[PDB]
Design an enzyme around this catalytic site. Sequence first.
Site, PDB file in Angstrom:
ATOM      1  N   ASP A   1     -25.170  20.150 -48.552  1.00 60.98           N
ATOM      2  CA  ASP A   1     -24.055  21.063 -48.734  1.00 60.98           C
ATOM      3  C   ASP A   1     -23.347  21.332 -47.430  1.00 60.98           C
ATOM      4  O   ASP A   1     -22.750  22.393 -47.250  1.00 60.98           O
ATOM      5  CB  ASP A   1     -24.574  22.375 -49.320  1.00 60.98           C
ATOM      6  CG  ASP A   1     -23.474  23.296 -49.773  1.00 60.98           C
ATOM      7  OD1 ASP A   1     -22.405  22.799 -50.201  1.00 60.98           O
ATOM      8  OD2 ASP A   1     -23.685  24.528 -49.680  1.00 60.98           O
TER       9      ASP A   1
ATOM     10  N   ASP B   1     -24.155  19.103 -53.496  1.00 57.70           N
ATOM     11  CA  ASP B   1     -23.212  20.057 -54.063  1.00 57.70           C
ATOM     12  C   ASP B   1     -21.792  19.618 -53.751  1.00 57.70           C
ATOM     13  O   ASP B   1     -21.574  18.849 -52.820  1.00 57.70           O
ATOM     14  CB  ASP B   1     -23.470  21.447 -53.451  1.00 57.70           C
ATOM     15  CG  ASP B   1     -22.929  22.607 -54.315  1.00 57.70           C
ATOM     16  OD1 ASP B   1     -22.154  22.372 -55.281  1.00 57.70           O
ATOM     17  OD2 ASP B   1     -23.267  23.778 -54.003  1.00 57.70           O
ATOM     18  N   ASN B   2     -20.819  20.130 -54.484  1.00 56.85           N
ATOM     19  CA  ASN B   2     -19.417  19.916 -54.167  1.00 56.85           C
ATOM     20  C   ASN B   2     -19.036  18.447 -54.110  1.00 56.85           C
ATOM     21  O   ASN B   2     -18.217  18.071 -53.318  1.00 56.85           O
ATOM     22  CB  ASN B   2     -19.070  20.614 -52.841  1.00 56.85           C
ATOM     23  CG  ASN B   2     -19.273  22.116 -52.906  1.00 56.85           C
ATOM     24  OD1 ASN B   2     -18.744  22.759 -53.782  1.00 56.85           O
ATOM     25  ND2 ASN B   2     -20.062  22.663 -52.004  1.00 56.85           N
TER      26      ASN B   2
ATOM     27  N   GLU C   1     -14.510  28.905 -66.369  1.00 57.27           N
ATOM     28  CA  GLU C   1     -14.217  29.588 -67.619  1.00 57.27           C
ATOM     29  C   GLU C   1     -14.695  28.766 -68.815  1.00 57.27           C
ATOM     30  O   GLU C   1     -14.135  28.853 -69.905  1.00 57.27           O
ATOM     31  CB  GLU C   1     -12.707  29.853 -67.716  1.00 57.27           C
ATOM     32  CG  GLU C   1     -12.308  31.271 -67.363  1.00 57.27           C
ATOM     33  CD  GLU C   1     -12.204  32.155 -68.587  1.00 57.27           C
ATOM     34  OE1 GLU C   1     -11.336  31.880 -69.444  1.00 57.27           O
ATOM     35  OE2 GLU C   1     -12.994  33.118 -68.695  1.00 57.27           O
TER      36      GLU C   1
END
Length: 207
Positions: free
Chosen positions: A132, A160-161, A190
Amino acid sequence: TKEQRILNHVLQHAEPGNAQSVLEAIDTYCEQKGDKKGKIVDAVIQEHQPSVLLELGAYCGYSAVRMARLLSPGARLITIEINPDCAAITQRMVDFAGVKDKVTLVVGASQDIIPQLKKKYDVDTLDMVFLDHWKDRYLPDTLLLEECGLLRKGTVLLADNVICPGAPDFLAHVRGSSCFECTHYQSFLEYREVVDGLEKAIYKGPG
Ligand code: NA
Protein backbone atom coordinates in the site's frame (compact mmCIF):
# COMPACT_ATOMS: atom_id res chain seq x y z
CA THR A 1 -0.50 18.71 8.48
CA LYS A 2 -3.28 16.51 7.10
CA GLU A 3 -1.93 13.30 8.63
CA GLN A 4 -1.42 15.22 11.88
CA ARG A 5 -5.02 16.39 11.63
CA ILE A 6 -6.21 12.78 11.20
CA LEU A 7 -4.37 11.81 14.36
CA ASN A 8 -5.79 14.81 16.21
CA HIS A 9 -9.33 13.83 15.21
CA VAL A 10 -8.82 10.26 16.46
CA LEU A 11 -7.41 11.58 19.74
CA GLN A 12 -10.53 13.71 20.28
CA HIS A 13 -13.23 11.25 19.14
CA ALA A 14 -12.04 7.63 19.49
CA GLU A 15 -11.86 5.46 22.61
CA PRO A 16 -8.30 4.80 23.89
CA GLY A 17 -7.30 1.16 23.49
CA ASN A 18 -10.18 0.41 21.11
CA ALA A 19 -8.89 -0.34 17.67
CA GLN A 20 -12.33 -0.50 16.08
CA SER A 21 -13.17 2.95 17.47
CA VAL A 22 -9.99 4.29 15.93
CA LEU A 23 -10.74 2.91 12.48
CA GLU A 24 -14.22 4.39 12.57
CA ALA A 25 -12.88 7.82 13.62
CA ILE A 26 -10.35 7.84 10.77
CA ASP A 27 -13.01 6.86 8.25
CA THR A 28 -15.34 9.61 9.49
CA TYR A 29 -12.65 12.32 9.21
CA CYS A 30 -11.26 11.20 5.86
CA GLU A 31 -14.66 10.88 4.18
CA GLN A 32 -14.81 14.70 4.24
CA LYS A 33 -12.10 14.66 1.56
CA GLY A 34 -11.89 2.55 3.86
CA ASP A 35 -14.42 0.49 5.80
CA LYS A 36 -15.77 -1.04 2.62
CA LYS A 37 -12.33 -2.23 1.58
CA GLY A 38 -11.94 -3.01 5.27
CA LYS A 39 -14.05 -6.12 5.07
CA ILE A 40 -11.79 -7.49 2.34
CA VAL A 41 -8.60 -6.88 4.33
CA ASP A 42 -10.19 -8.35 7.44
CA ALA A 43 -11.25 -11.50 5.58
CA VAL A 44 -7.75 -12.16 4.23
CA ILE A 45 -6.15 -11.77 7.66
CA GLN A 46 -8.73 -14.03 9.28
CA GLU A 47 -8.42 -16.74 6.62
CA HIS A 48 -4.63 -16.91 6.65
CA GLN A 49 -3.76 -16.12 10.30
CA PRO A 50 -0.33 -14.75 9.44
CA SER A 51 2.33 -14.91 12.18
CA VAL A 52 4.66 -12.50 10.35
CA LEU A 53 3.09 -9.78 8.23
CA LEU A 54 5.00 -7.12 6.29
CA GLU A 55 3.21 -3.88 5.48
CA LEU A 56 4.76 -1.61 2.87
CA GLY A 57 3.47 1.91 3.49
CA ALA A 58 2.22 3.07 6.89
CA TYR A 59 0.87 6.55 6.23
CA CYS A 60 -1.32 7.48 9.26
CA GLY A 61 -1.50 3.93 10.65
CA TYR A 62 -5.02 3.01 9.53
CA SER A 63 -4.03 -0.21 7.80
CA ALA A 64 -1.62 -1.20 10.56
CA VAL A 65 -4.39 -0.82 13.15
CA ARG A 66 -6.85 -2.72 10.92
CA MET A 67 -4.53 -5.65 10.44
CA ALA A 68 -2.88 -5.77 13.85
CA ARG A 69 -6.20 -5.92 15.69
CA LEU A 70 -6.94 -9.29 14.02
CA LEU A 71 -3.54 -10.88 14.63
CA SER A 72 -2.88 -13.53 17.24
CA PRO A 73 -0.86 -12.76 20.36
CA GLY A 74 2.83 -13.02 19.51
CA ALA A 75 2.24 -12.23 15.82
CA ARG A 76 4.37 -9.54 14.28
CA LEU A 77 3.40 -6.75 11.91
CA ILE A 78 6.51 -5.10 10.48
CA THR A 79 5.64 -1.85 8.70
CA ILE A 80 8.03 0.04 6.44
CA GLU A 81 7.47 3.75 5.90
CA ILE A 82 9.86 6.03 4.10
CA ASN A 83 8.73 9.28 5.75
CA PRO A 84 9.78 9.79 9.44
CA ASP A 85 6.84 12.16 10.08
CA CYS A 86 4.31 9.61 8.82
CA ALA A 87 6.09 6.99 10.92
CA ALA A 88 5.81 9.18 14.04
CA ILE A 89 2.08 9.57 13.44
CA THR A 90 1.60 5.85 12.73
CA GLN A 91 3.35 4.99 16.00
CA ARG A 92 1.06 7.31 17.95
CA MET A 93 -1.97 5.85 16.18
CA VAL A 94 -1.04 2.24 16.91
CA ASP A 95 -0.21 3.23 20.51
CA PHE A 96 -3.65 4.85 20.94
CA ALA A 97 -5.38 1.90 19.30
CA GLY A 98 -3.85 -0.52 21.79
CA VAL A 99 -2.01 -2.65 19.23
CA LYS A 100 1.58 -1.45 19.70
CA ASP A 101 2.85 -4.78 21.07
CA LYS A 102 2.29 -6.36 17.64
CA VAL A 103 3.91 -3.60 15.57
CA THR A 104 7.51 -2.86 14.49
CA LEU A 105 7.78 0.38 12.57
CA VAL A 106 10.81 0.69 10.33
CA VAL A 107 11.69 3.97 8.72
CA GLY A 108 13.36 3.85 5.35
CA ALA A 109 13.16 2.87 1.69
CA SER A 110 11.64 -0.52 1.00
CA GLN A 111 14.40 -1.12 -1.57
CA ASP A 112 17.01 -0.85 1.19
CA ILE A 113 15.06 -2.43 4.07
CA ILE A 114 13.74 -5.57 2.35
CA PRO A 115 17.20 -7.09 1.88
CA GLN A 116 17.91 -6.47 5.58
CA LEU A 117 14.70 -8.00 6.98
CA LYS A 118 16.20 -11.38 7.70
CA LYS A 119 19.29 -10.06 9.47
CA LYS A 120 17.97 -6.93 11.15
CA TYR A 121 14.44 -8.07 12.09
CA ASP A 122 14.99 -11.81 12.50
CA VAL A 123 12.59 -12.80 9.72
CA ASP A 124 12.78 -16.23 8.08
CA THR A 125 9.88 -16.03 5.65
CA LEU A 126 6.77 -13.84 5.53
CA ASP A 127 3.27 -15.25 5.86
CA MET A 128 1.70 -12.17 4.33
CA VAL A 129 2.63 -8.91 2.67
CA PHE A 130 0.31 -5.87 2.39
CA LEU A 131 1.29 -3.52 -0.44
CA ASP A 132 0.00 0.00 0.00
CA HIS A 133 2.97 2.25 -0.66
CA TRP A 134 3.95 4.03 -3.87
CA LYS A 135 2.10 2.32 -6.71
CA ASP A 136 5.15 1.98 -8.95
CA ARG A 137 7.05 0.15 -6.21
CA TYR A 138 4.54 -2.75 -6.04
CA LEU A 139 6.24 -4.73 -8.79
CA PRO A 140 9.90 -3.97 -7.92
CA ASP A 141 9.33 -4.75 -4.24
CA THR A 142 7.48 -7.97 -5.09
CA LEU A 143 10.46 -9.07 -7.21
CA LEU A 144 12.81 -8.05 -4.41
CA LEU A 145 10.90 -10.04 -1.79
CA GLU A 146 11.14 -13.09 -4.03
CA GLU A 147 14.84 -12.54 -4.76
CA CYS A 148 15.52 -12.15 -1.05
CA GLY A 149 13.92 -15.49 -0.22
CA LEU A 150 11.20 -13.92 1.93
CA LEU A 151 8.28 -15.63 0.16
CA ARG A 152 7.32 -19.26 0.77
CA LYS A 153 4.58 -21.48 -0.70
CA GLY A 154 1.33 -19.94 0.42
CA THR A 155 2.63 -16.48 1.34
CA VAL A 156 -0.17 -14.08 0.60
CA LEU A 157 0.35 -10.76 -1.11
CA LEU A 158 -2.54 -8.36 -0.79
CA ALA A 159 -2.18 -5.20 -2.84
CA ASP A 160 -4.50 -2.24 -2.20
CA ASN A 161 -5.53 0.48 -4.64
CA VAL A 162 -4.68 -1.64 -7.68
CA ILE A 163 -7.29 0.05 -9.89
CA CYS A 164 -7.20 3.61 -8.56
CA PRO A 165 -4.64 5.09 -8.99
CA GLY A 166 -3.72 1.63 -10.23
CA ALA A 167 -0.78 -0.75 -10.25
CA PRO A 168 -1.24 -2.31 -13.70
CA ASP A 169 2.36 -3.45 -14.10
CA PHE A 170 2.13 -5.36 -10.82
CA LEU A 171 -1.24 -6.91 -11.78
CA ALA A 172 0.04 -8.02 -15.17
CA HIS A 173 3.05 -9.67 -13.57
CA VAL A 174 1.35 -11.63 -10.83
CA ARG A 175 -1.63 -12.58 -12.98
CA GLY A 176 0.48 -13.78 -15.89
CA SER A 177 3.10 -15.52 -13.76
CA SER A 178 2.71 -19.18 -12.85
CA CYS A 179 4.32 -18.32 -9.52
CA PHE A 180 1.23 -16.50 -8.20
CA GLU A 181 -2.40 -17.57 -7.89
CA CYS A 182 -4.50 -14.37 -8.06
CA THR A 183 -7.94 -13.22 -6.93
CA HIS A 184 -9.37 -9.79 -7.58
CA TYR A 185 -11.63 -8.08 -5.04
CA GLN A 186 -13.82 -5.19 -6.20
CA SER A 187 -14.47 -2.19 -3.98
CA PHE A 188 -17.86 -0.56 -4.49
CA LEU A 189 -19.04 2.99 -3.93
CA GLU A 190 -22.58 3.08 -2.59
CA TYR A 191 -22.85 -0.60 -3.54
CA ARG A 192 -23.20 0.50 -7.19
CA GLU A 193 -19.97 1.46 -8.94
CA VAL A 194 -16.64 -0.35 -8.85
CA VAL A 195 -14.20 2.44 -8.01
CA ASP A 196 -11.22 0.43 -6.81
CA GLY A 197 -10.05 -3.03 -5.90
CA LEU A 198 -7.49 -5.19 -4.19
CA GLU A 199 -5.53 -8.10 -5.55
CA LYS A 200 -4.65 -11.17 -3.56
CA ALA A 201 -1.74 -13.11 -4.98
CA ILE A 202 -0.63 -16.34 -3.29
CA TYR A 203 2.93 -17.45 -3.98
CA LYS A 204 3.34 -20.95 -5.35
CA GLY A 205 7.13 -20.95 -5.69
CA PRO A 206 9.62 -20.04 -8.44
CA GLY A 207 8.96 -23.41 -10.09
NA1 NA B 1 -0.55 -15.85 -11.95
